[PDB]
């Protein structure tokens, strides 16, 4: 209820203050890496990020007003989307490179170390170049990331009055995005165009998550942390 009674600026400051930290990798550059090592670095990193993401989700306005079964469901469908949009956001100031960690900056040739990883790398890179071209703002980013959390699992669900509450919160995040674009000087036509451009990117983020979900499911059945396999079996 308090999430609905939030002004747009209080919505932004709540999302900004809830941002998770940028974690570091175990990456030791004494080694050029094998496939298992580079995969171990990304797997260990994503496992520690999931713990922060879970506690980040509890501070998303309206997420706490949901039942525990619904919270588990939204996170199970959206966890990789949230990891990826964060990676893409961290990589905005590093063209042609993915900043997995401050000490783990990788280009596409290093992504070829893992079989099939290069295709997902280019998609992640193209998304980061898109955020760069649009000059995506951190206020817009935290809105998009919370939209993913509330949207990606809403149609994979009597009583269903909770889905109506989620849509009310989603409408509030939409109001917040327009409020930000109106403050930056954009005209009404420019606000609606930018709003559409940002939300169409979520379609590609869903695409990368689906492809990445198959890539991880292959690595499991080809020789990951327990929390990650538990998330990976949610797509099965």
């Amino acid at each position: 209820s308090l999430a609905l009674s939030l002004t747009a600026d209080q919505m932004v400051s709540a999302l900004l203050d809830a941002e998770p930290p940028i974690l570091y990798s175990e990456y030791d550059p004494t080694r050029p890496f094998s496939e298992a090592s580079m995969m171990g670095l990304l797997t260990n990193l994503a496992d520690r990020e999931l713990v922060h993401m879970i506690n980040w989700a509890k501070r998303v306005p309206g997420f706490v007003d949901l039942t525990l079964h619904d919270q588990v469901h939204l996170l199970e469908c959206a966890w990789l989307e949230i990891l990826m949009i964060g990676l893409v956001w961290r990589s905005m100031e590093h063209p042609g490179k993915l900043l997995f960690a401050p000490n783990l900056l990788l280009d596409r040739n290093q992504g070829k170390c893992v079989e099939g990883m290069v295709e997902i790398f280019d998609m992640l890179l193209a998304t980061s170049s898109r955020f760069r071209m649009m000059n995506l703002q951190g206020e817009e980013f935290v809105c998009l990331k919370s939209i993913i959390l509330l949207n990606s699992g809403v149609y994979t669900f009597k009583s269903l009055e909770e889905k109506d509450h989620i849509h009310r919160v989603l409408d509030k995040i939409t109001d917040t995005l327009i409020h930000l674009m109106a403050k930056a000087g954009l005209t009404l036509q420019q606000q609606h165009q930018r709003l559409a451009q940002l939300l169409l990117i979520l379609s590609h983020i869903r695409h990368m998550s689906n492809k990445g979900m198959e890539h991880l499911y292959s690595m499991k059945c080809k020789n990951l942390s327990d929390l990650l396999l538990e998330m990976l079996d949610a797509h099965r």
Binding site: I54, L68, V72, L75, E76, D226, M231
Partner: peptide, 10 residues
């Protein structure tokens, strides 16, 4: 009771 189920509580 899964891991995610418990971390959301704690």
């Amino acid at each position: 009771h899964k891991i995610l189920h418990r971390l959301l509580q704690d």
